[PDB]
Amino acid sequence: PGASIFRCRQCGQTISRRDWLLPMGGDHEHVVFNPAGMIFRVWCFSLAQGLRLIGAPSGEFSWFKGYDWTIALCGQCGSHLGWHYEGGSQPQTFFGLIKDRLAEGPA
Numbered sequence: 001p002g003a004s005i006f007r008c009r010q011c012g013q014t015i016s017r018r019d020w021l022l023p024m025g026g027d028h029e030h031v032v033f034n035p036a037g038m039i040f041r042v043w044c045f046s047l048a049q050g051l052r053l054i055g056a057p058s059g060e061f062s063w064f065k066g067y068d069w070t071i072a073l074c075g076q077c078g079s080h081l082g083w084h085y086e087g088g089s090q091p092q093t094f095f096g097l098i099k100d101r102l103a104e105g106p107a
């Protein structure tokens with residue numbers, strides 16, 4: 001399989017797997033805008049590794065009802081890869097990662 005692991009596009013750090021994609025609200029892809037109007041194509045993952053979660057969670061402008069977010073950087077290079085979500089149910093936690101900041105390839 002050549003499409004099974006997601007790595008940081010900037011450095012190659014191991015981040016997630018196609019197996020760990022999560023359909024939240026019926027789709028793994030969510031297109032969203034931050035308060036500064038920046039558009040992100042976000043893929044939900046049940047699980048991710050190789051990140052560094054920055055600060056404490058915030059509910060402010062959460063794209064996912066009932067979840068608080070933390071900034072998720074690449075733990076290797078510090079590139080902004082997305083957010084970790086916590087404090088909801090089914091599931092309690094998940095990752096929302098910026099699709100175009102990942103590279104897909106072989107295990």
Ligand SMILES: O=C1CC[C@H](n2ccc3ccccc32)C(=O)N1
Nearest residue numbers: 033034035060061062063069083
């Ligand atoms: O679910 C989220 C993640 C963080 C994101 N976000 C990105 C910048 C920003 C500044 C203030 C509050 C929120 C912010 C967002 O809009 N929603």
Ligand SMILES: [Zn+2]
Nearest residue numbers: 008011074077
């Ligand atoms: Zn990186």
